[PDB]
Amino acid sequence: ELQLRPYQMEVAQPALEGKNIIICLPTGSGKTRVAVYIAKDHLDKKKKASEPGKVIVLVNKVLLVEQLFRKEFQPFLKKWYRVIGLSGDTQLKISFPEVVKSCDIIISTAQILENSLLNLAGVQLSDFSLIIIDECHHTNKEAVYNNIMRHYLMQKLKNNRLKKVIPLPQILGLTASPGVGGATKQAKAEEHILKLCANLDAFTIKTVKENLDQLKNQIQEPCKKFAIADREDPFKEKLLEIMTRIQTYCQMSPMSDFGTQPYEQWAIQMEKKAAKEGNRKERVCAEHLRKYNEALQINDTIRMIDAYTHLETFYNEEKDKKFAVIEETDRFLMTLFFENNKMLKRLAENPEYENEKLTKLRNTIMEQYTRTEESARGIIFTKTRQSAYALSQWITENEKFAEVGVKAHHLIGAGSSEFKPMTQNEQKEVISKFRTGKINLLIATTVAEEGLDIKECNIVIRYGLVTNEIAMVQARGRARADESTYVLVAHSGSGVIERETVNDFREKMMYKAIHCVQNMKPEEYAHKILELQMQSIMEKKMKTKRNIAKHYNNPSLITFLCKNCSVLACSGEDIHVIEKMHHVNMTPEFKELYIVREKQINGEIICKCGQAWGTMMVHKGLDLPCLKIRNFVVVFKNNSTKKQYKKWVELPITFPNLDYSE
Amino acid sequence: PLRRKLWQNYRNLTFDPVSANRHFYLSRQDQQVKHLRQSRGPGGPGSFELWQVQCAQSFQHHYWEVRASDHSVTLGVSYPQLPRSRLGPHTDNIGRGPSSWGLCVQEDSLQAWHNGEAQRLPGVSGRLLGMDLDLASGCLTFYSLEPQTQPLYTFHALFNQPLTPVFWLLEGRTLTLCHQ
RNA sequence: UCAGUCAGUCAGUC
RNA sequence: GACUGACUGACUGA
Ligand SMILES: Nc1ncnc2c1ncn2[C@@H]1O[C@H](COP(=O)(O)OP(=O)(O)O)[C@@H](O)[C@H]1O
Numbered sequence: 001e002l003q004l005r006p007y008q009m010e011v012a013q014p015a016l017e018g019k020n021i022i023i024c025l026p027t028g029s030g031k032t033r034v035a036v037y038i039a040k041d042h043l044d045k046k047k048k049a050s051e052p053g054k055v056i057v058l059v060n061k062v063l064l065v066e067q068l069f070r071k072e073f074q075p076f077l078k079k080w081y082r083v084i085g086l087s088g089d090t091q092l093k094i095s096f097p098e099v100v101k102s103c104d105i106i107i108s109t110a111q112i113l114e115n116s117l118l119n120l121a122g123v124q125l126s127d128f129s130l131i132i133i134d135e136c137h138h139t140n141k142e143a144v145y146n147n148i149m150r151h152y153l154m155q156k157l158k159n160n161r162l163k164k165v166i167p168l169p170q171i172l173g174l175t176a177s178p179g180v181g182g183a184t185k186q187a188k189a190e191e192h193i194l195k196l197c198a199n200l201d202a203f204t205i206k207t208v209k210e211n212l213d214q215l216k217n218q219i220q221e222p223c224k225k226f227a228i229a230d231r232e233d234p235f236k237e238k239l240l241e242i243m244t245r246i247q248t249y250c251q252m253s254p255m256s257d258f259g260t261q262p263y264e265q266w267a268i269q270m271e272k273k274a275a276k277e278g279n280r281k282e283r284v285c286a287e288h289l290r291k292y293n294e295a296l297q298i299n300d301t302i303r304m305i306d307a308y309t310h311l312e313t314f315y316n317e318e319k320d321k322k323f324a325v326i327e328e329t330d331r332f333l334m335t336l337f338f339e340n341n342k343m344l345k346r347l348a349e350n351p352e353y354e355n356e357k358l359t360k361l362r363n364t365i366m367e368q369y370t371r372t373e374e375s376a377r378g379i380i381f382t383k384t385r386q387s388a389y390a391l392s393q394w395i396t397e398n399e400k401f402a403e404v405g406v407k408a409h410h411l412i413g414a415g416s417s418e419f420k421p422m423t424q425n426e427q428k429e430v431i432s433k434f435r436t437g438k439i440n441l442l443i444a445t446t447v448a449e450e451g452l453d454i455k456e457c458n459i460v461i462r463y464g465l466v467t468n469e470i471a472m473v474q475a476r477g478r479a480r481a482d483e484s485t486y487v488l489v490a491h492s493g494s495g496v497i498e499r500e501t502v503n504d505f506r507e508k509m510m511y512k513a514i515h516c517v518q519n520m521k522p523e524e525y526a527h528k529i530l531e532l533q534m535q536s537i538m539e540k541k542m543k544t545k546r547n548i549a550k551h552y553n554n555p556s557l558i559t560f561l562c563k564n565c566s567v568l569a570c571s572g573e574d575i576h577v578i579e580k581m582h583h584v585n586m587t588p589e590f591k592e593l594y595i596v597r598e599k600q601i602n603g604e605i606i607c608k609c610g611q612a613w614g615t616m617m618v619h620k621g622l623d624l625p626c627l628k629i630r631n632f633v634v635v636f637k638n639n640s641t642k643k644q645y646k647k648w649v650e651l652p653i654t655f656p657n658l659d660y661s662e
Numbered sequence: 663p664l665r666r667k668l669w670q671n672y673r674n675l676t677f678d679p680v681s682a683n684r685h686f687y688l689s690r691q692d693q694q695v696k697h698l699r700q701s702r703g704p705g706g707p708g709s710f711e712l713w714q715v716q717c718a719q720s721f722q723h724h725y726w727e728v729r730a731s732d733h734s735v736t737l738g739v740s741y742p743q744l745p746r747s748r749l750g751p752h753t754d755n756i757g758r759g760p761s762s763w764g765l766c767v768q769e770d771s772l773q774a775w776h777n778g779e780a781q782r783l784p785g786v787s788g789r790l791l792g793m794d795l796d797l798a799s800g801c802l803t804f805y806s807l808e809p810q811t812q813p814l815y816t817f818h819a820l821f822n823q824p825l826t827p828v829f830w831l832l833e834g835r836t837l838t839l840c841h842q
Numbered sequence: 843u844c845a846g847u848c849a850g851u852c853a854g855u856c
Numbered sequence: 857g858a859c860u861g862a863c864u865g866a867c868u869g870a
């Protein structure tokens with residue numbers, strides 16, 4: 001029953017016949033169903049006159065592929081048309097062009113199309129007719145969407161040349177907060193909204209200005225509330241003791257206090273320069289103090305035991321690696337660390353000591369669930385995966401929560417050498433368990449902030465998060481329920497509340513700026529858009545020429561050296577690549593240099609130092625170990641300096657492939 | 663003046679250690695109650711599984727005052743046949759059946775429960791509360807004392823058993839009595 | 843213009 | 857279930 005409410009028809013009226021536009025209603029306004037109706041009329045009208053017609057929907061998070069394929073298009077067009085839902089996990093049994101010729105509504109993640117389009121038989125952007133772009137504000141400086149729209153713009157300028165045609169597909173785009181590109185003045189916000197409209201090749205913004213009362217009724221402004229706090233505990237300063245002594249061992253310069261980002265960055269660069277020098281007795285110390293600072297920062301974010309586990313999990317594996325070479329400065333660390341960590345482990349287990357933030361979060365969750373009485377779903381937004389899993393554990397362990405009826409689980413994205421990785425089907429089952437109601441307090445990261453559809457979520461909580469204004473306009477949105485509450489938690493130490501205020505002010509700026517661009521004179525709009533279109537293409541040409549300059553390569557010039565020691569490992573010629581992807585070596589003496597270590601399918605390589613070089617990987621019946629450049633140092637033969645590269649594409653060198661003939 | 667006229671029907675009250683719940687704590691000559699995170703031993707028989715505590719006194723009119731540390735707390739009265747076990751997820755039992763009558767205070771609004779039903783009542787800033795009951799007329803009335811006196815609500819009923827006061831507390835919350 | 847943590851997207855070898 | 861490779865965006869820092 002596609003009986004649209006009035007204001008949806010108001011916003012969709014211009015788009016219903018030509019005139020590619022944009023559309024923005026606040027969250028909870030059923031924009032997806034506007035897309036459904038527009039697609040239906042597009043296909044019906046094209047069929048009536050018997051001309052070829054297709055429609056493609058671009059989405060930008062995989063979860064949403066299944067959501068929009070199961071909830072909304074499928075029932076409303078199950079009968080008239082053929083709809084297929086494709087993504088990045090499904091193991092296609094058929095190539096993409098056969099799929100496009102096979103169906104006529106394609107729900108896909110945009111990166112798939114972009115792969116299939118730069119592959120030159122492929123597919124040309126003119127095959128399609130309607131291009132719906134969901135959450136299209138991500139069209140910005142060289143994003144995944146913008147490559148597609150740039151092919152569209154090149155064709156448009158080619159048609160402006162041709163006029164002195166190949167029809168271009170009609171475009172539609174859906175947003176909730178087009179956002180301002182970091183602007184403090186009205187003129188710059190005006191400029192940014194114009195640039196967005198330019199890259200989409202729109203005609204207007206077309207926001208509802210007639211049926212205001214009805215819209216203000218459907219959407220509910222949720223209640224904002226502030227849970228803020230800022231208990232004596234040795235642990236932070238107890239470890240400050242050890243780390244201060246460790247610094248004093250080498251007398252390094254702080255330049256700032258502990259527990260904050262500049263210290264971590266400082267440790268990184270000092271480590272890098274020392275490694276370039278070769279100054280051992282300092283590298284290990286700097287990296288260990290970095291680890292200790294990370295421990296403090298995790299102690300800030302999450303419960304204490306997780307910090308202690310991070311520490312012990314680093315160190316025990318360190319000693320496991322070190323005692324394998326058995327079969328001066330180094331001992332100085334463990335001989336201290338082990339006494340102190342036994343002390344810690346007995347200290348951290350004592351639960352009357354606590355973090356500060358967690359107590360306020362504990363008060364919020366349980367109080368608010370107690371008042372709800374079994375009509376309550378909640379989403380807690382955080383920053384790091386590890387934070388998600390740790391919060392799930394902390395909800396499960398202490399038993400008072402489970403009596404008030406909170407049932408919890410963590411939702412994170414697929415694809416990090418820690419607790420346990422969630423995988424695609426587990427995630428789908430998690431949201432499936434969450435929609436009905438036997439998982440009740442979902443703890444999530446950035447993945448579920450633009451797109452979830454849960455009809456009932458009373459409670460949205462934000463945990464010590466700092467972010468731009470669109471990732472705050474949407475996160476309030478996800479609380480798509482009546483009597484909603486958006487509760488913010490932070491301790492004033494880091495700039496969270498000031499960020500909240502600037503974000504709210506930027507929200508006001510953004511709305512008013514859309515109201516500004518809504519009312520220009522059409523001549524000015526058309527000409528400004530034309531100029532803006534030209535600008536992006538010219539700047540892309542400039543960046544491309546700089547890029548082809550930057551790529552510029554004797555593979556035999558350089559030599560790789562160990563990074564904790566400086567014992568020469570091998571030269572460039574010994575390196576090969578498997579399928580332009582895996583850098584590997586086949587050499588026999590280079591095989592006698594390293595030591596495997598299993599604690600296993602794939603074995604980790606170790607130098608004499610204990611530092612890791614790479615892993616064993618088996619290819620086409622050869623047994624063969626690889627190398628990672630992050631673990632080495634490059635020594636040239638022109639200028640005898642010492643350089644480190646983070647990832648292999650940085651190095652200007654091109655390597656040949658693994659002749660396999662031997 | 664109204665509270666002064668009430669105070670000649672004031673009655674002193676004290677808790678019962680048996681009815682106290684596990685994580686709770688009794689203090690000040692058994693006249694103040696606090697609730698902590700760490701368990702105070704196993705519960706054992708005679709203790710309400712849901713988060714309530716009852717006073718030792720009961721009434722075969724009467725009036726008294728209760729001070730509350732913060733919001734999200736409940737005060738009420740039941741017949742002696744109040745169930746002590748738990749069969750539902752939510753952890754409050756007053757007002758779910760006809761056998762009791764309760765009033766729950768929160769930051770937003772008030773809710774007065776009986777027989778499994780309640781109505782929203784506009785919220786109050788104050789924490790101190792007063793409560794009166796007359797068995798002869800069979801009526802139970804609540805009062806907010808600060809800044810002024812307000813007859814918040816009245817319950818009409820016929821009683822065939824004495825009433826015992828019962829209190830429901832969250833974590834980190836405290837509740838004190840008054841004496842004269 | 844460069845570095846740094848963080849999240850998300852795709853593609854290979856077992 | 858395990859191992860890699862590369863585009864991308866927000867945050868902080870010169
Ligand atoms: N015609 C309609 N009648 C009633 N509810 C509708 C209608 N159209 C959409 N909705 C509601 O809108 C919700 C979908 O909104 P959606 O467009 O996904 O929000 P967002 O724009 O944030 O993605 C659905 O849960 C549905 O209940």
Ligand code: ALF
Nearest residue numbers: 027031176450451
């Ligand atoms: F289109 Al939305 F939240 F606004 F999915």
Ligand SMILES: [Mg+2]
Nearest residue numbers: 031032134451
């Ligand atoms: Mg949407």
Ligand SMILES: [Zn+2]
Nearest residue numbers: 562565607609
């Ligand atoms: Zn080494």
